[PDB]
Amino acid sequence: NKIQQINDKELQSGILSPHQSWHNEYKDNAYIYIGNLNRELTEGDILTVFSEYGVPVDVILSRDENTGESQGFAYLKYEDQRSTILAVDNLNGFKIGGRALKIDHTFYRPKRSLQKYYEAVKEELDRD
RNA sequence: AAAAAAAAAAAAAAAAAAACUAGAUACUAACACAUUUAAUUUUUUUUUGUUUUUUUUUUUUU
């Protein structure tokens, strides 16, 4: 896990400031990439693990257009962008149901074929 | 500086091991004695990182 190696070397250099961090590049990005998921975990199951580090306002699990089953990666946006640093360097390499997940910062591009999916997601997270 | 004589018993071709097993303690080799710090395989997983885009002949004749 390369992200977990560069946080150890950053922490030993005594950097500890977010603006001197390698995280600083992604200060405008509130989305995260989540990868190497187990196939049984779902959208409401992703919001449960990742709510430890903040309030997730959008979520997208990517799953095939034919068979409708999980490709094994998702996307999640937090209300506060500093929750992104939390999730990235504190939940990375965490074994969940056999496999260790990979979290990275990201720029998310929404698509047209998942449009009404985005309101089937939004009406859950508009409740809270 | 100096100026000999003479009266018939023995002879030898020259203190030590290999082993087992602890033990004395000299030495040898310009031996090696901050580190060497930007090109280059330990880095391994059941493939799985989400927008747009990268073309076609008019008629005819020997």
> DSSP characters for A23-87?
GGGGTT--EEEEES--TT--HHHHHHHGGGSS-EEEEEEEE-TTT--EEEEEEEEESSTHHHHHH
Tokens of A90: 């504190």
Resolution in units of Å: 2.5
* Strand B-proximal protein residues, Cβ less than 7 Å: A 33, 35-36, 62, 71-73, 75, 99, 102, 104, 106-112
Which amino acid is present at A106?
A: T
Burial status of residue A18 (CB atoms within 10 A of its CB: 0-12, 13-18, 19 or more): exposed
Protein CA at A97 to nucleotide C1' at B24, angstroms: 71
d(CA A102, CA A107) in angstroms, rounded, equals: 16
How far in angstroms lies nucleotide B48's C1' from the CA of residue A36?
9
Cα A105 from Cα A29, distance rounded (Å): 7
